[PDB]
Swiss-Prot record:
Entry GO terms, CC: chloroplast thylakoid membrane
Name of the protein: Plastocyanin
Organism the protein comes from: Dryopteris crassirhizoma (Thick stemmed wood fern)
Plastocyanin-like domain location: 1-102
Binding site for Cu cation: H37, C87, H90, M95
Length: 102
């Protein structure tokens, strides 16, 4: 699945902000525009340790930002469920999305 992160106008949005994928399908996030952004998954409370580890592996390090030098990030989540992801710099500006894994 492909998700665009930001736009040419500098809005703090994921495009689209709700994606549904099959187990193990890569989600490629690609930066659009010049504002750097990243993608970090929220870990659901009470998630099993295998899901917590998958989500951490599918998250950017919060000291990492996409830039036109590092324009994409690829995440794979195998466990069925819905998961929220957010951008660290623009979290308070509600730059967040949902990933449903079938
Ligand atoms: Cu951002």
């Amino acid at each position: 699945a492909k998700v665009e992160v930001g736009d040419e106008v500098g809005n703090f949005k994921f495009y689209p902000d709700s994606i549904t994928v099959s187990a193990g399908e890569a989600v490629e996030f690609t930066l659009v525009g010049e504002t750097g952004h990243n993608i970090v998954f929220d870990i659901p409370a009470g998630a099993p340790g295998t899901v917590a580890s998958e989500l951490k592996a599918a998250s950017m390090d919060e000291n990492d930002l996409l830039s036109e030098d590092e324009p994409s990030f690829k995440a794979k989540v195998s466990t069925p469920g819905t998961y929220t992801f957010y951008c660290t710099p623009h979290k308070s500006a509600n730059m967040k999305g949902t990933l449903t894994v079938k």
